[PDB]
């Protein structure tokens, strides 16, 4: 009863961070060693759980969130961080119990002339609540004017595109991120190891 | 002028550790991502590590991931490579390398193409052997070291560590026809080389021949006279 | 990891001729290829980036071409300064990888080596080891075979070779081969020979000596 992990990690395309994807994992067994024993990952921090213990612990349902950001922003995917990504795109709760996995994906997500399919949110009237997905495309009002659905002076379209090129500096290169969330409600647990 | 002064290399035993430093000058250090590349003795170039301008992103080759850490202090124009649990195959000349910026005008993301500047390099030697002076032996001229009226003589510099040694003949007086060979790494971990010179056979009786060997890493200066041998 | 295979390992040319150095990638790297020159005891120097773009201050006799997986460096009208080692590099796929390198050596005519042999010194013998040294002087090209014979038994595994770089005047090479034994093993045998084969020699050249007579 294998859990669909190669689905999440080996997916052809990844989601933009503002429209981050979430896959629920339920009613299956999963080996976490086939993951945390890979040297391919550039980042593997865990919170509220020993990664080694994951093979013998068991949880209600598991959430796998995935998206693309640029390298310098990977540090923002952590409990209690601030910045453009942590505030307007994807925010972790301070009580976060799970693991954050990230690896460079310049060979998949960079394109000659620039891959503009990956977007992030530059402006938002307020900070995101944890695990909130804001896909609003209405125009930001940075001044006092009513933009009437068109962009002008201090009337900004809130989403902006990464220009991922193969020659970008490593800090501006695309990174694929997967966030595993583990919750233990009072409902029966259906995701455990061997 | 663009300059990258490197420091902090040298000798280490297997399982030891080093910290290489590279101070930059002549350009805006904080605007450049920076790399470490290495070159093993007699081998080609291997890329090692990269760090972004801010230092928030680092990337390593697989054979050093988890052992090496690249870092930078932009306030001090400094780049560092911390090397832990060093292995014999980590022996190399290490270069801090500045990639060539191609960022056009005021775009937010930086772009780079190839390496446009290299430091002079730091030697890093990971070996069980320890610093040791050399033994100097004569390679005596004889009938077996003649091709017609050409005689060949020399001296053999054996069992020293680390590199290098310097060899002269008659205190720099004799330089014509002198071959000093690159050192070879013996199976014991120590180095060996030989220095030879061809002279006219008839000059062996009249001309005296002394070889002068200097090993600075251990403060050794030996002079050995090479005399003919019946054979 | 993308492998960058350079070919060939050595080109032997004279000044004024044209050097064509090939580099092939195990998968496509578009035009993201560079070429560097390295001289002994110096860091590499960037010559070409973007497959075809010259670095600032490169002479126009250096030129680059190619894409996808096939790349070429052309050095027109070779000057004495251009005889060095050359590396290709792809710089967009992690890990960044370099080619094995190609040496551009000076061309000259075939020259047979002069062969000499040296028995171990007595001071070394009193220290418990014995080094027999065979010397090959001023030959070309670099390819040369030295075979040690002890009482006509072919030895392998206890000798080491070391070859100089191309001589600045006659463009020849020199080589040394050391056979190392313990004192006891050295005194178990009588005849020590080094037999040299080289394309400049009609037949193998053997130089030998008898231990104790020397
Ligand atoms: C199909 As999708 C949300 O991964 O672009
Ligand atoms: C940089 As050059 C090969 O002209 O010395
Ligand atoms: C393969 As080579 C002789 O150019 O080091």
Measure the CA–CA gap between C195 and C175, rounded to whole angstroms. 13
Buried b (16+ CB within 10 A) or exposed e, A66-89: bbbbbbbbbbbbebeeeebbbbbb
Measure the CA–CA gap between C140 and C148, rounded to whole angstroms. 21
Tell me the two tokens of residue B218. 């251990």
* Most C CBs within 10 Å, among A39, A166, A174, to test the C interface: A166
**Considering CB atoms only, which of C91, C99, C214 is closest to B113?**
C91
Tell me which residue has tokens 């693991």. A99
Measure the CA–CA gap between B69 and B64, rounded to whole angstroms. 9
Tell me the two tokens of residue B227. 């005399």
* CB contact at 8 A, B67 and A182: no
Q: CB atoms < 10 A from the CB of A53, how many? A: 11
Name subunits touching B (3+ CB pairs < 8 A). A, C
Q: Which of ligand 2's atoms lies nearest the C-alpha of C47?
A: 1
* CB contact at 8 A, B8 and B122: yes
Buried b (16+ CB within 10 A) or exposed e, A9-42: beeeebbbbbebbeeebeeeebebeebbeeeebb
Query: In this structure, which topology does domain B135-225 adopt according to CATH?
Result: Immunoglobulin-like (2.60.40)
B208 alpha carbon, distance to own chain's centre: 33
| Burial status of residue B156 (CB atoms within 10 A of its CB: 0-12, 13-18, 19 or more) | buried
* CB contact at 8 A, B52 and B71: no
Min distance B44 CA to chain C CA atoms (Å): 6
Q: Which domains does chain C have, with CATH numbers?
A: 4-106 (2.60.40.10), 114-210 (2.60.40.10)
Tell me the two tokens of residue C122. 């007595």
Buried b (16+ CB within 10 A) or exposed e, B41-53: eeebbbbbbbbbb
Measure the CA–CA gap between C91 and C35, rounded to whole angstroms. 11
CA B33 to ligand 2 center in whole angstroms: 26
CB contact under 8 A, B44 and C131: no
Upper half-sphere CA count for residue B202 (Cβ side, 13 Å): 1
Closest C-chain CA to B227: C121
Q: In degrees rounded to 5, what are phi and psi of residue B190?
A: -100, 165
Query: Does any ligand 2 atom lie closer than 6 A to the CB of residue C102?
Result: no
Give chain C's end-to-end CA distance (angstroms, integer): 56
Measure the CA–CA gap between A190 and A28, rounded to whole angstroms. 7
Q: Is B44 helix (H, G, I), strand (E, B) or coil?
A: coil
* CB contact at 8 A, B6 and B121: yes
Measure the CA–CA gap between B195 and B150, rounded to whole angstroms. 17
Measure the CA–CA gap between C114 and C173, rounded to whole angstroms. 11
Tell me the two tokens of residue C34. 């560079």
Measure the CA–CA gap between C101 and C35, rounded to whole angstroms. 10
* CB contact at 8 A, C196 and C113: yes
Tell me the two tokens of residue A108. 């998949």
Largest pairwise CA distance in chain C: 68
List C-alpha distances in Å: A20 to A59, A97, A119, B100: 23, 19, 10, 35
Bridge partners for A22 per DSSP: A65
Query: Does any ligand 2 atom lie closer than 6 A to the CB of residue C59?
Result: yes
Q: In degrees rounded to 5, what are phi and psi of residue B72?
A: -150, 150
Measure the CA–CA gap between C158 and B185, rounded to whole angstroms. 13
Q: Determined by which method? A: X-ray
* CB contact at 8 A, B140 and B227: yes
Measure the CA–CA gap between B5 and B22, rounded to whole angstroms. 5
Measure the CA–CA gap between C170 and C175, rounded to whole angstroms. 15
* CB contact at 8 A, B155 and B41: no
* CB contact at 8 A, A43 and A102: yes
| Burial status of residue B163 (CB atoms within 10 A of its CB: 0-12, 13-18, 19 or more) | middle
Same fold: B3-126 with B135-225: yes
Min distance B93 CA to chain C CA atoms (Å): 10
Angle at A60 between CA A55 and CA A66, to 5 degrees: 75
Q: Which of A112, A140, A139, A122 is nearest to A17 (CA)?
A: A122
Torsion C152-C156-C162-C166 (CA) sign: positive
Domain ranges of chain B: 3-126, 135-225
CB contact under 8 A, B194 and C133: yes
Q: Which of ligand 2's atoms lies nearest the C-alpha of C45?
A: 1
CA C106 to ligand 3 center in whole angstroms: 14
Residue A106 in contact with partner chain C when CB distance is under 8 A: yes
Largest pairwise CA distance in chain B: 79
| H/E segment holding residue C187 | helix C183-187
Q: Is B2 helix (H, G, I), strand (E, B) or coil?
A: coil
Tell me the two tokens of residue C178. 């050391």
Q: In degrees rounded to 5, what are phi and psi of residue C19?
A: -100, 130
Measure the CA–CA gap between B41 and C59, rounded to whole angstroms. 30
Q: Which of A177, A132, A134, A162 is nearest to A8 (CA)?
A: A177
The residue count of chain B comes to 231
**Cβ-based neighbours of C195, under 8 Å, separated by 6 or more:** C146, C147, C148, C149, C204, C205, C206
Q: Is C156 helix (H, G, I), strand (E, B) or coil?
A: coil
Q: Is C175 helix (H, G, I), strand (E, B) or coil?
A: strand
Tell me the two tokens of residue B107. 């775009």
Tell me the two tokens of residue C139. 């030959």
Task: Show residues of chain C in contact with B100, CB under 8 Å.
Answer: 46, 49, 55
* CB contact at 8 A, A174 and A70: yes
Q: Which of A172, A150, A124, A143 is nearest to A18 (CA)?
A: A124
Torsion A71-A77-A81-A87 (CA) sign: positive
Task: Tell which phi-psi region holds residue B159, choosing left (phi > 0), alpha (psi between -120 and 50) or beta.
Answer: left
**Considering CB atoms only, which of B99, B118, B152 is closest to C137?**
B152
- State the count of interchain CB pairs (< 8 A) between A and C: 14
For ligand 1, pick from A11, A13, A19, A178 the residue to mutate: most ligand atoms within 8 Å of CB. Answer: A13
Residue B107 in contact with partner chain A when CB distance is under 8 A: yes
List C-alpha distances in Å: B76 to B23, B55, B79, C41: 8, 14, 9, 29
Tell me which residue has tokens 């997916």. A11
Tell me the two tokens of residue A149. 């659905």
Q: What is the DSSP pairing of strand B146-147 with strand B78-83?
A: unpaired
Q: In degrees rounded to 5, what are phi and psi of residue C114?
A: -90, 130
| Burial status of residue C40 (CB atoms within 10 A of its CB: 0-12, 13-18, 19 or more) | exposed
Q: In degrees rounded to 5, what are phi and psi of residue B76?
A: -115, 15
Measure the CA–CA gap between B32 and B104, rounded to whole angstroms. 14
Q: In degrees rounded to 5, what are phi and psi of residue B222?
A: -115, 140
* CB contact at 8 A, B39 and B92: yes
The residue count of chain C comes to 214
Ligand nearest to the CA of A16: 1
Q: What is the DSSP pairing of strand B10-12 with strand B122-126?
A: parallel
Q: Is C141 helix (H, G, I), strand (E, B) or coil?
A: coil
Closest C-chain CA to A106: C93
Tell me which residue has tokens 């000499």. C116
**Cβ-based neighbours of C3, under 8 Å, separated by 6 or more:** C25, C26, C97
CA C26 to ligand 2 center in whole angstroms: 29
Min distance B120 CA to chain C CA atoms (Å): 6
**CATH architecture of the domain formed by B3-126:** Sandwich (2.60)
CA B10 to ligand 2 center in whole angstroms: 31
Angle at C181 between CA C178 and CA C185, to 5 degrees: 145
Resolution in angstrom units: 2.3
Torsion B38-A171-A39-B73 (CA) sign: positive
**Considering CB atoms only, which of B54, B111, B112 is closest to A72?**
B54
The residue count of chain A comes to 194
* Ligand 3-lining residues (CB < 6 angstroms): C 9-10, 85, 100-103
Q: What is the DSSP string of chain A?
A: -B---HHHHT-SS--BSTT-EEEEE-SEE--SHHHHT-TT-SEEEEESS-TGGGGT-EESEEEEEEEEEEGGGGGGSSTT--SHHHHHT----TT--EEEEEEE-HHHH--TT-B---EEE---SSPPPTT------SPEE-SSS--TTS-BTTEE-SEEE--B-TTB-GGGSEEEEEEEEEE--SSPP-EE--
**Cβ-based neighbours of B95, under 8 Å, separated by 6 or more:** B6, B36, B37, B38, B39, B118, B119, B120, B121, C43
Angle at B83 between CA B82 and CA B86, to 5 degrees: 170
Tell me which residue has tokens 């900070």. A127
Q: Is C85 helix (H, G, I), strand (E, B) or coil?
A: strand
Upper half-sphere CA count for residue B100 (Cβ side, 13 Å): 19
In chain A, which residues are followed by a C-to-N distance beyond 2.5 Å, i.e. a gap? Answer: none
Measure the CA–CA gap between A167 and C181, rounded to whole angstroms. 55
| Burial status of residue C114 (CB atoms within 10 A of its CB: 0-12, 13-18, 19 or more) | buried
Bridge partners for C93 per DSSP: none
Measure the CA–CA gap between C150 and C159, rounded to whole angstroms. 12
Tell me the two tokens of residue A118. 């990956």
Measure the CA–CA gap between A129 and A90, rounded to whole angstroms. 9
Measure the CA–CA gap between C110 and C142, rounded to whole angstroms. 10
Measure the CA–CA gap between B143 and B211, rounded to whole angstroms. 21
Tell me which residue has tokens 């949110």. A121
**Considering CB atoms only, which of B150, B152, B179 is closest to C164?**
B179
List C-alpha distances in Å: A106 to A115, A167, A168, A170, A178: 11, 9, 9, 9, 16
Upper half-sphere CA count for residue A54 (Cβ side, 13 Å): 25
Measure the CA–CA gap between A114 and B104, rounded to whole angstroms. 14
**Considering CB atoms only, which of B112, B192, B231 is closest to C214?**
B231
Torsion A126-A127-A128-A133 (CA) sign: positive
| H/E segment holding residue B23 | strand B18-25
For ligand 1, pick from A10, A17, A21 the residue to mutate: most ligand atoms within 8 Å of CB. Answer: A21
Q: What is the DSSP pairing of strand C62-67 with strand A58-59?
A: unpaired
């Amino acid at each position: 009863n294998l859990c669909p992990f190669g689905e999440v990690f080996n997916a052809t395309r990844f989601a933009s961070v503002y429209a981050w994807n979430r896959k629920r994992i339920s009613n299956c067994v999963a080996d976490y060693s086939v993951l945390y024993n890979s040297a391919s990952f550039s980042t593997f921090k865990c919170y509220g759980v020993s990664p080694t213990k994951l093979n013998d612990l068991c949880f209600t349902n598991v959430y796998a969130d995935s998206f693309v950001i640029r390298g310098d922003e990977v540090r923002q995917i952590a409990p209690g961080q601030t910045g453009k990504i942590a505030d307007y795109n994807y925010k972790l709760p301070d009580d976060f119990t799970g693991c954050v996995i990230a690896w460079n994906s310049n060979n998949l997500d960079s394109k000659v002339g620039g891959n503009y399919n990956y977007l992030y949110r530059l402006f938002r009237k307020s900070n995101l609540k944890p695990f909130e997905r804001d896909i609003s495309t209405e125009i930001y009002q940075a001044g006092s004017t009513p933009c009437n659905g068109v962009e002008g002076f201090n009337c900004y379209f809130p989403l902006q595109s990464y220009g991922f090129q193969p020659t970008n500096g490593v800090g501006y290169q695309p990174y694929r991120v997967v966030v595993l969330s583990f919750e233990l409600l009072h409902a029966p647990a259906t995701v455990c190891g061997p | 002028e663009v300059r990258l002064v490197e420091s902090g290399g040298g000798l280490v035993k297997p399982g030891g550790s080093l910290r290489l430093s590279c101070v930059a000058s002549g350009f805006t250090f904080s605007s450049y991502e920076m790399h470490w590349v290495r070159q093993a003795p007699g081998k080609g170039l291997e890329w090692v590590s990269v760090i972004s301008e801010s230092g928030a992103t680092t990337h390593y080759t697989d054979s050093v991931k988890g052992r090496f850490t690249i870092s930078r202090d932009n306030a001090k124009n400094s780049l560092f490579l911390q090397m832990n649990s060093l292995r014999a195959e980590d022996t190399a000349v290490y270069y801090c390398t500045r990639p060539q910026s191609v960022t056009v005008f005021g775009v937010a993301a930086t772009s780079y193409e190839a390496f446009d500047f290299w430091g002079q390099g730091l030697r890093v030697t990971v070996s069980s052997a320890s610093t040791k002076g050399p033994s100097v032996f004569p390679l005596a001229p004889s009938s077996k070291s003649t091709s017609g009226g050409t005689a060949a003589l020399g001296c053999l510099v054996k069992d020293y560590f680390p590199e290098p040694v310097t060899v002269s003949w008659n205190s720099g007086a004799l330089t014509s026809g002198v071959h000093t060979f690159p050192a070879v790494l013996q199976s014991s971990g120590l180095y060996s080389l030989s220095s030879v010179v061809t002279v006219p056979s008839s000059s062996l009786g009249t001309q005296t021949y002394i070889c002068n060997v200097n090993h600075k890493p251990s403060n050794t200066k030996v002079d050995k006279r090479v005399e003919p041998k019946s054979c | 990891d993308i492998v960058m295979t350079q070919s060939p390992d050595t080109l032997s040319l004279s000044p004024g001729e044209t050097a064509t150095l090939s580099c092939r990638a195990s998968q496509s790297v578009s035009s993201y290829v560079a070429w560097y020159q390295q001289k002994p005891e110096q860091p590499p120097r960037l010559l070409i980036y973007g497959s075809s773009s010259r670095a600032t201050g490169m002479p126009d006799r250096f030129s680059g071409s190619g894409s996808g997986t096939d790349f070429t460096l052309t050095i027109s009208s070779l000057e004495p300064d251009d005889f060095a080692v050359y590396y290709c590099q792809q710089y967009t796929n992690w890990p960044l990888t370099f080619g094995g390198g190609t040496k551009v050596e000076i061309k000259r005519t075939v020259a047979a080596p002069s062969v000499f042999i040296f028995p171990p010194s007595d001071e070394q013998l009193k220290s418990g080891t014995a080094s027999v040294v065979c010397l090959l002087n001023n030959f070309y090209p670099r390819e040369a075979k030295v075979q040690w014979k002890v009482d006509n038994a072919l030895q392998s595994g206890n000798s080491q070779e070391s070859v100089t770089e191309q001589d600045s005047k006659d463009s020849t090479y020199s080589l040394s081969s050391t056979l190392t034994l313990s004192k006891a093993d050295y005194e178990k045998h009588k005849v020590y020979a080094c037999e040299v084969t080289h394309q400049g020699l009609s037949s193998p050249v053997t130089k030998s000596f008898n231990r104790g007579e020397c």
